[PDB]
Structure formats: C-alpha cells, structure tokens
Design a protein around this ligand. Structure first.
Ligand SMILES: NC(=O)c1ccc[n+]([C@@H]2O[C@H](COP(=O)([O-])OP(=O)(O)OC[C@H]3O[C@@H](n4cnc5c(N)ncnc54)[C@H](O)[C@@H]3O)[C@@H](O)[C@H]2O)c1
Ligand SMILES: NC(=O)c1ccc[n+]([C@@H]2O[C@H](COP(=O)([O-])OP(=O)(O)OC[C@H]3O[C@@H](n4cnc5c(N)ncnc54)[C@H](O)[C@@H]3O)[C@@H](O)[C@H]2O)c1
Lengths: 330, 325
C-alpha cells in the first residue's frame, strides 16, 4: 500500500512520512530539496527503524513532467499528499512570479500526471491565510476568502483548480486542509524545522538578543496578538486522517474542506510563558508597536474523526527538545 | 520600434498585427497554430503591402521557455500584447487543467522572459467575463470568475497586479472585452473557428439558429450582450499601447473596458444580419453592457464601427471565404 508525498523532505512533510511509515505504508517522497536537506529523510528513516526501507526518495521538481510521469507509472499510488510549495509571505511579494511559477505550475503538472496515471485521490495542504484577517473569530469553513499576498493567492488558486478538476471528473476525491502555524518537533528531538516560536527558540539558545513583541495594546486579554498554533505531530496526523476519509468514506465527500488546529488561540505572552516553563530559559522582551485569528475545528473533529492531542506546553517542550539537541539544524 | 504579439494568428490577434504593421511597427508574432492557421498571417502581410516585410513569425509555444528566450535576446523589444490563450468556455469546464496549463503556465513563462530580457511593458487580452447587477458594468464592478476559462483570466489579471507591486518599472494595461464581431472591411482576413453560427445559417451549412431563452426581461425577450467590431478591438489595444508610451507615468496596472457602450438583443443582431446579407436566418426558439466611459476618457478611444458595419464586414469576409483559408 503506497502513498506519494510531495515535499516530504520539509518540516510538515517529514513528520508526515514518519507517521505514515510507522503505520504500515510505503512512502514515495518527491523533493526539489531547495528548501530542505536529505538528512531529514535519512533521520525520518532511522526513526522509522525497520520501516526505513519502505521510504523511497526522488530528488525531482514537481514541474518536471517527464521525471514525474516516470514515478507515477512505477507504482499504483493509493493517494497523493501535496506539501511542495513556497511558504514565505515577504518573499512572495518581492518575487510573485517565483511563487506563482512554483506553486501553480507544480500543482497543475501534478494534477495532470495523476489524472493520466489513474490516481485521482488527493490531499492538499493549504494555508489558513485565505480567511484573511476577519472581524469574527472562530473562522469556519464557510468564512469568506481573500488573498493578502501572492503566497495566499497561489494557495487560494490551487483550491479553485482542485474544485474545477472535481467538477470536470467526478472520479476525483480531494480534501483541502487549512491550518495555522505548525510548531514543535518529534518528541525524540531528532527531526525538526530549520514565525514566532522559531524566533523564541533562537533567542532562548543565544543566537538572538531578544524577542521583539510587535503590538502591546490589542483588544486581547494581555494586549498582544493572538494566533492559532498546532503541534506539528498533530498536523501530520491530520493529513493522514483525511487519507483515511479518502480510503473509507470517499463516496460521501468530493473536494471537501477541513481546517485543522487546536481550536483555541493563544497570545504571544501566553506562548512565551509556555516556552519558559518547558525550556527553563527566560527570553527577554523589547516592546514595539489583526488582534485575534484562529480556526474553528468543530467540522474536522466531526466528519474527519480527528482531534489534536497536544497542547501548547508540550509543543514548546518538543520544540526545545529538538532545537537544544540540534542548534545547527542538520 | 518592435512589438511582440502573442496569439497574433487568430482573429483579434490577426487584426491587431495588421493595424500595427500599418502604423510603422516591426511586429514579431509568436503562435503555435493550435486554433489558428498560418495563412492568416500571410494574408495579413499582403494587406500591409510594403509594411508586410516587417512581420517576423515564430511558430513557438509560450510554454517553451528556451524557444522564447531566443526571440527576446535577438529582438530588443518595446512592448508585448498577449492575445495567446484558450477561449472555449465549454471545454474549459470538461478540461480545466488544459486551460490552467496553457493559460497560466504560458503567461507566467512569458512574464518571466520579459522581465529577464529587460522588457516590462505589457498589454493583456483579458475578458469582461470577469464581471460575472447594475446594467452598465464599470471597471470597479465586483469581479466574479464563472468558470475555469474565467478564472484563468481573473488569475492572470491578479498576477500582473502582483508583479507591478514587486517592480514599479512594470507598466501593464488590462483590457476587458466581450463578443468581438466582424472582420477586416476587405474581407480577406477574419475569424475561422453567436455571429459565426448565424453566418453559417445564411451561407447554407447550418439549417437554423437556436435561440436559447425566449423569455427575458427585454423588449425582444431575448438576451442582450455587448458587441464590438474586431477592427475596433484591434486599435483599442493600439490606444492602450499608445498610453504605455506617451503617458506611462500616471498609470500602474490599469484595467480598461473596450466596447461600444451599448447592448444588443439576440433578435436585433440576426435582424441586422438579415439586412446586411439579404439572406434570412430561420430561428428555433428554446443583460451585459460595458462602461466605455473610462476607456474613451483616459485612452482617447471610442469604437468607430456599429452593429451595422459588423454584419457588413462579417458577411463580406464570410461570403468571399466560406471555408476559411
Ligand atoms: N520546486 C518544487 O516545485 C518542489 C518540488 C518538490 C518539493 N518541494 C519542496 O516542498 C517543501 C515544502 O516544505 P517546507 O518546509 O518549505 O514547508 P512546510 O513543510 O512547513 O509546509 C508544507 C506546505 O504547507 C504550506 N503551509 C500552509 N500553511 C502553513 C503554515 N502556517 N506554516 C507552514 N507551512 C504552511 C506551505 O506553503 C507548504 O507548501 C520544500 O522543502 C520544497 O523544497 C518543492
Ligand atoms: N503559443 C501559445 O502559447 C499558444 C498556445 C495555444 C494556442 N495559441 C493561439 O492562441 C490564439 C488564440 O486566438 P483565437 O484564434 O482564439 O482568436 P480570438 O480573438 O478568439 O482570441 C484571442 C483573445 O481574444 C479574446 N476573445 C475573443 N473572443 C472572445 C469571447 N467571445 N469571449 C471572451 N474572450 C474572447 C480571448 O480572451 C483571447 O485572449 C490562437 O491563434 C492559437 O493558435 C497559442
């Protein structure tokens, strides 16, 4: 039983193939590796132990169609999990074509090769920046959508391409997942990343002088911004939950949308406190000049049979655990 | 002065490249003849006469990055008019990927080579189908993609707005238009695929026209859409390209409406064609406007032909070429 995972060498993707491997799956990963290193897949393989053999890695770009058609004709892939993409808001503005070319062309070629190789089961990882900054929280899947930046637009376009493909061929079964701010690392502290918590962690180890808190007078309990965080191990279990919805309850759902997350938001000060407790270090602050945004996960918990298991305190534990062991990444 | 025109071999593309050659512009046309035929460019060079020797034609696909960078490296360009694209709303639904591939990827590649070889002036052939209310559709009208072909147009219409934010040196004009009708008054070049259908009825290949919607909120009870002479459309882009050159400080990524500012019913157009052609159009029965005030104010452009000249030129090109080229 094989699953193909694009951008599997990345942060969310590497934690994905590990849980996949551990739960009896052959995982084929496709990565350009411009945003990551091979070591992450060598370590996810080690963490998988005897299941390390099941992981197969292809250093190939999703836009390359010939290299991609070869992969899809070498296995019957039960489904495809699409992580490949670029995830930098500031970078997407100065270089919008660089984002539109990578995200849009990469997905289109992917959807084409899949349809041509009889693989029409997809799970796409989408960003919850599509809701924009709304007046009302919690954000439900019925909330209106808007694009704050080219990165957000490129994500919202893919969602529309997925919807259009579904209406063109009812054989397509797509699940679109939206989520907020993955944080943490594998409890072993052997794989991890390389937003706020990264900045907190680099100043907790000494690399940075302090954490600058932007905004101290918001309409929140403490006055600092409230965002939606989610344990990365929890989020990588969310993408798998959808894959089971595709395997068991496929008939019910066609190109459905489930947004993931803990369901509650926490503030910068609430989050710094949760990291000082787990870390034992004390991050200095310097005060400088949306107040709240978070995801309503009621839908996911009901239809997808999924619920986050880890709170903010174990997120910082694991983040500190991996980072303190690996200060220079890989 | 050299202009690059993509999709210049078909209809609006063929007519515009003709009126660019006629105004002293060395024009390089890029087209992979998917929907058009090469004869349309040969016969455009003829109608240009002496200026016909300024038509450089490269049968290449915009999604072929290496083929495209050769064309930009040799010719030092001044601007690009992007007609290239797939227009069939019908198959855009059943084959959406084919549309996102050809349109989105072909456009993103062109934009990359342009900014690379130092040429950041573009005129885009958008579509007013992005309007998806109030009878006159202004540019500020809320945008609404109704199908995959419409969303490719709206996506490309957002990518340019994003490109301009990243590099202020980019000057772009987005031209939204709908329902081009007619051909060159000579009748030597035109469209070779509602007017095309009523035409085939007059020329005998079709038995009758099918009027879809005999009840509507209109005088005739039939739908009312906007129509613009293809020759009006062609030099409508010329007015845009004229703003990129003469007044390209004020403008950023501007969007303009091209049309006559008036709407025609279905029975009015067929009634018009029955006069201009003399042949009657049997019918078997089964509102969109353009706010041209902006374009005629800041572009110095107003459609010069009317619905009578559209059927005249369309019946002229069609009776002289009943089987295309
Ligand atoms: N060039 C290509 O087309 C291509 C091909 C194959 C793989 N890749 C790879 O895909 C990998 C993606 O991994 P990554 O570590 O950059 O991203 P990631 O693993 O942190 O996230 C995976 C995907 O989730 C998206 N995302 C949505 N909301 C997010 C949030 N709140 N935080 C973070 N990501 C969010 C990202 O845009 C990304 O596309 C990269 O390593 C890249 O090298 C690219
Ligand atoms: N090189 C490439 O990238 C590439 C690939 C495939 C096709 N093509 C070419 O693209 C050209 C497309 O031109 P065409 O022959 O369709 O002529 P056309 O005039 O119908 O289409 C060209 C432009 O006019 C617009 N248009 C015209 N009528 C319209 C209507 N009723 N509704 C909405 N928009 C309308 C379209 O938006 C399009 O951008 C063809 O000549 C084909 O050969 C180019």
């Amino acid at each position: 039983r094989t699953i193909l995972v694009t951008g599997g060498a990345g942060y969310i993707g590497s934690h994905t193939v590990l849980q996949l491997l551990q739960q009896g799956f052959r995982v084929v990963v496709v990565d350009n590796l411009d945003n990551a290193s091979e070591a992450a897949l060598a370590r996810v393989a080690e963490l998988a132990g005897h299941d390390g053999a099941n992981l197969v890695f292809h250093k190939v770009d999703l836009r390359d169609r010939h290299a991609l058609v070869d992969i899809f004709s070498s296995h019957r892939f039960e489904a495809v999990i699409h992580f490949a993409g670029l995830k930098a808001v500031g970078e997407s503005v100065h270089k919008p074509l660089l984002y539109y070319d990578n995200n849009l062309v990469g997905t289109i070629t992917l959807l084409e090769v899949m349809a041509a190789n009889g693989c029409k089961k997809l799970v796409f990882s989408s960003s919850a920046t599509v809701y924009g900054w709304p007046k009302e929280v919690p954000c439900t899947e019925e909330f209106p959508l808007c694009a704050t930046n080219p990165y957000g637009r490129t994500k919202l376009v893919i969602e529309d391409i997925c919807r259009d493909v579904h209406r063109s061929d009812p054989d397509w079964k797509i699940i679109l997942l939206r989520y907020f701010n993955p944080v943490g690392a594998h409890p072993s502290g052997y794989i991890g990343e390389d937003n706020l918590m990264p900045y907190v962690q680099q100043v907790a180890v000494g690399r940075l002088p302090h954490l600058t808190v932007y905004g101290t007078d918001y309409s929140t309990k403490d006055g600092t911004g409230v965002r939606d965080y989610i344990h990365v191990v929890d989020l990588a279990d969310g993408h798998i939950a959808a894959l089971r919805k595709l395997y068991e309850d496929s008939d019910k759902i066609g190109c459905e949308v489930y947004n993931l997350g803990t369901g509650k938001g926490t503030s910068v000060l609430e989050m710094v406190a949760a990291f000082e407790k787990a870390s034992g270090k004390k991050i200095p602050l310097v005060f400088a000049g949306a107040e709240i945004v978070y995801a309503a996960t009621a839908k996911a918990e009901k239809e997808l049979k999924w619920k986050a298991k880890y709170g903010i305190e174990e997120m910082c534990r694991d983040l500190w655990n991996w980072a303190s062991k690996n200060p220079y990444g890989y």
